[PDB]
Each structure stands twice: as structure tokens, then as C-alpha cells.
Amino acid sequence: PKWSARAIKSLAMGELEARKLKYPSTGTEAILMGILVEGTSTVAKFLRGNGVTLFKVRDETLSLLMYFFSPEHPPLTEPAQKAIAWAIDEKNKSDVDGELTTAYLLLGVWSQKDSAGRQILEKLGFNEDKAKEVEKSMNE
Numbered sequence: 001p002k003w004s005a006r007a008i009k010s011l012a013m014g015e016l017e018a019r020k021l022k023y024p025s026t027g028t029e030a031i032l033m034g035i036l037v038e039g040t041s042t043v044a045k046f047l048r049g050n051g052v053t054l055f056k057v058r059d060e061t062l063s064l065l066m067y068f069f070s071p072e073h074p075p076l077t078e079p080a081q082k083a084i085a086w087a088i089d090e091k092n093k094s095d096v097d098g099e100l101t102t103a104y105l106l107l108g109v110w111s112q113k114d115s116a117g118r119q120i121l122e123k124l125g126f127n128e129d130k131a132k133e134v135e136k137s138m139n140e
């Protein structure tokens with residue numbers, strides 16, 4: 001359970017993005033946006049290179065989701081929770097030492113097949129080959 005600095009900034013950026021945008025909860029789409037707002041990790045550059053950018057993610061999000069009753073603190077959705085749990089679980093069995101980077105967080109969103117993050121990623125051109133490609137990057 002040792003989070004990289006860029007993973008921590010990402011989540012923080014995701015939750016703040018959820019408040020900025022007046023969302024009733026903080027979901028997988030915020031995690032994904034959090035990574036891109038952070039923007040300096042290996043996986044963020046990878047996404048940005050394969051046509052997945054904040055602008056397009058922000059856009060693809062409206063195409064999914066008025067909202068005038070959102071709480072001051074948008075709680076994590078169950079899929080967001082499941083994506084973070086997935087990142088923990090994958091790292092605790094990786095049979096290697098290391099911190100859990102933003103790539104684990106991205107594969108966590110990707111592992112949640114009903115999630116808004118899963119959808120948006122596909123809608124932008126992300127696929128299983130690219131996920132094995134990121135999973136290869138996370139191991140070098």
C-alpha cells in the first residue's frame with residue numbers, strides 16, 4: 001500500500017475535478033481525468049499520445065452525464081472504489097517490489113467493465129492491446 005507521488009496527485013486532482021464540475025459523486029471518469037490533469041507520469045504521456053486527452057475526456061464525459069444538487073464532497077462511487085481496490089490487489093501479488101504507480105490506477109479503471117472510465121477510454125481508441133502495452137510499461 002505504498003502510493004507513488006504521481007498516483008496521489010492524480011486522485012487529488014480527480015476529486016477536485018469532480019467538485020469543479022459539480023458532479024454528485026467522484027467516479028472512474030474523475031480518476032482518469034486526475035491522471036491527465038497530473039500529466040507527467042509514463043501512462044499519462046502514453047494516453048496523450050494515443051488520442052486520450054483531458055479535453056476529449058472532459059468532452060466524452062458530458063456525452064454521458066443538469067446537476068444542481070451535488071454535495072460539497074462528492075463521494076467515490078462503488079466502481080471508483082473497485083478500481084482502487086484492484087490497483088492494490090494487483091500490486092500486492094506482482095511478485096516484485098515497487099510502489100503502485102498511475103499505471104495501476106489506469107488498469108484499475110480499465111478492469112471495471114461497467115465503469116464510465118472503461119467506456120470513455122474505449123470511445124477514444126483504448127483497447128486490450130494498449131492495456132497490455134501499459135502493463136508492460138509498468139514492469140519496464
Ligand SMILES: [Cl-]
Pocket residue numbers: 004006007041042101102103
Ligand atoms: Cl507514476
